[PDB]
Structure 1
Amino acid sequence: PNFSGNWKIIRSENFEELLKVLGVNVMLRKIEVAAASKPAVEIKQEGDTFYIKTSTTVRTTEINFKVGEEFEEQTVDGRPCKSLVKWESENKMVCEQKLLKGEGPKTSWTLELTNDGELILTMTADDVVCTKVYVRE
């Protein structure tokens, strides 16, 4: 199995709560939920090298990384971080995020495949766990 595809969302839990537990105010949460609550996910995987694009009608975000090599991106509440992805187990990867400036509650994300070929995204912030589920288009 592998992660490449244009993945369509079928479930999304607790995205706004991830923002709220990080202290993002209601104004800013409305803007983030409107732009990114239920994005499509496009992945191009070549072994350990990844391109991932999340998109809605109004916002696209793209990252490029290789497992085991540091890269820069932003946390879900918009703070710059340095990220590092590792395989937790076969076809489950976990991204550790370290803030570039100051401190804050821990954030992470995970992408994994189920035995039937669904893609499960987990995002964490403090004690909140957001789950999004996708199938290939």
Structure 2
Amino acid sequence: PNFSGNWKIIRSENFEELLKVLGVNVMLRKIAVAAASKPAVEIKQEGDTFYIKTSTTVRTTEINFKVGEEFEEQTVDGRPCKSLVKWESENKMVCEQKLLEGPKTSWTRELTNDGELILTMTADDVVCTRVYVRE
């Protein structure tokens, strides 16, 4: 599927809990949660090549990767990692992360038949789920 476009958040579940179990300081956690409530998301996909920009004033993540080639990013709680994206199924990509020790973290993105984008972010047993619609 083509994920390209600007995406707008409509649901977030377990974001604060994810940060909480990862030990993020409560003062920083409240700033992170509030910033994450209204991110600006831009995706440009050309085959297996992805540009994914998620912007908030206090944290912008900008990754330009090819599916099946390793790249550097940060975990959700800000620790440097090596990431590797693969297609799990036809409409779902799964990213495995390894720290540059800690919780086992990952993220997934998929598109529904209606064109809603579902992001999950995991740390051990805690799963955060965020749903977006294309502008």
TM > 0.5: yes
Aligned counterparts of 2:34 and 2:60: Cα–Cα separation in 1: 12
Aligned counterparts of 1:91 and 1:44: Cα–Cα separation in 2: 16
Identity of aligned residues (%): 98
Verify: 1:59 aligned to 2:59, yes or no. Answer: yes
Residues 38 and 126 of structure 1: is their aligned pair in 2 closer, same or farther, counting only changes over 3 Å?
farther
Residue 56 of structure 1: CA displacement? 3.0
Tell me which residue corresponds to 1:9: 9
Paired residues of 1:110 and 1:123 also in contact (CA < 8 A):
yes
CA-based RMSD of the aligned residues comes to: 1.3
Paired residues of 1:15 and 1:37 also in contact (CA < 8 A):
no
Structure 1 SS opposite 2:88: strand
Task: Name the count of aligned residue pairs.
Answer: 135
TM score, norm. by length of structure 1: 0.92
Residue 129 of structure 1: CA displacement? 0.7
Paired residues of 2:68 and 2:85 also in contact (CA < 8 A):
yes
Greater mean alpha carbon deviation, residues 19-28 or residues 75-84:
19-28
Paired residues of 1:95 and 1:108 also in contact (CA < 8 A):
yes
Aligned counterparts of 2:103 and 2:58: Cα–Cα separation in 1: 28
- Any idea what the Cα deviations from partners look like across 1:3-49, whole Å, max 9, x if unmatched? 00101111111111111111112122123223334423210000000
